[PDB]
Amino acid sequence: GIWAVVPLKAPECAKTRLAGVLSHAARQALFFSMASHVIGTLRASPRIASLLVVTPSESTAEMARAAGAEILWGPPDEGMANACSRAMAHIAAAGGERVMFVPGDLPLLDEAAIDMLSRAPVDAIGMAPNRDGHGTNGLICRPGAIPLFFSGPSFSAHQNAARRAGIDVWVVRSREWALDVDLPADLEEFESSVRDAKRRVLC
Ligand SMILES: Nc1nc2c(ncn2[C@@H]2O[C@H](COP(=O)(O)OP(=O)(O)OC[C@@H](O)C(=O)O)[C@@H](O)[C@H]2O)c(=O)[nH]1
Ligand SMILES: [Cl-]
Ligand SMILES: [Mg+2]
Ligand SMILES: [Mg+2]
């Protein structure tokens, strides 16, 4: 009985840390591409009972419904932590057993990745770090086990929240969880695994 929660911005103010290397339109294109991939991946997962997108944008909300998500309104520019917290409280009020927070910028995410994080015991915090190992690209818990600390040194914050509460932690590290696209270096790493995949799978 896992609810998946994908927080998503307005497309006109998405991936601001790529504004040096992509145009306004190139950032919208990458934002939508990655988000319907994340949403579509969770939607096809036999492990995801329900799928909620949190967004302030009619544009984002229509794309998300079309990909099969239910929609929760959030105000703009509150950050991932408060958008996920809003959803967690709605899901908790509504009887939700477990919730998995997944950002919309994981272009390599697969069924294998969802399955592994969903195999954390119900009474633990499941936690998937980013490539530099300071951030959090997935967390699954009982609604209300810890408060949320997404963005910045989030991995540290989550681990410390679990320690304080004496709650077990299951860390899941993989190529597919770790690469979120925020920075130019991140986009190039994405581009580079997509060329590897032409060669390995095709030629
Ligand atoms: N509804 C709502 N959605 C938002 C908002 N702010 C951003 N998001 C979404 O939260 C997700 C991650 O934003 P991003 O800039 O990639 O965060 P990042 O630095 O990688 O760190 C987050 C997490 O991965 C971590 O490492 O702790 C994306 O799907 C954003 O669109 C917002 O105020 N409202
Ligand atoms: Cl974004
Ligand atoms: Mg990110
Ligand atoms: Mg990140």
Residue numbers in the entry: 12 to 214
Task: Quote what the paper states about this structure.
Coenzyme F420 is a microbial redox cofactor that mediates diverse physiological functions and is increasingly used for biocatalytic applications. 3PG-F420 is formed via activation of 3-phospho-d-glycerate (3-PG) by CofC, but the structural basis of substrate binding, its evolution, as well as the role of CofD in substrate selection remained elusive. Instead, enzyme assays revealed that 3-phospho-d-glycerate (3-PG) is activated by CofC, presumably forming the short-lived intermediate 3-(guanosine-5′-diphospho)-d-glycerate (GPPG), which is further transferred to the FO core by the action of CofD. Here, we present a crystal structure of the 3-PG-activating CofC from Mycetohabitans sp. B3 and define amino acids governing substrate specificity.
From diffraction data collected to 2.4 Å the crystal structure could be solved by molecular replacement with a model of two superimposed structures (Mtb- FbiD and Methanosarcina mazei CofC, Mmaz-CofC). The overall structure was similar to the known homologs with the core of the single-domain protein being a six-stranded mixed β-sheet. Intriguingly, after initial refinement both molecules in the asymmetric unit independently showed unambiguous difference density for GPPG, the reaction product of GTP with 3-PG, completely immersed into the active site pocket. Each building block of GPPG (i.e., guanine, ribose, phosphate, and glycerate) is bound by several interactions. Guanine is distinguished from adenine by two H-bond donors to its oxygen (main-chain nitrogen of V65 and P86) and two H-bond acceptors to its amino group (main-chain carbonyl group of E89 and G90). The α- and β-phosphates are bound by two Mg2+ ions, which in turn are positioned by three aspartates (D116, D193, D191) similarly as had been shown for FbiD before. Hence, GPPG is tightly bound, in fact, it turned out to be still quantitatively bound after purification of the protein from E. coli cell lysate, where both substrates were present. The 3-PG moiety is primarily bound by H-bonds with the side chain of S165 to the carboxy group, apparently a highly conserved binding site of the carboxylate of the C3-acid as known from Mtb-FbiD. More interactions with the carboxy group arise from H-bonds with main-chain nitrogen atoms of T147 and S162, the latter being critical for selective 3-PG activation. The reason why the 3-PG adopts a new orientation is the main-chain rotation of S162, the CA and CB of which then squeeze the 3-PG into the productive conformation.
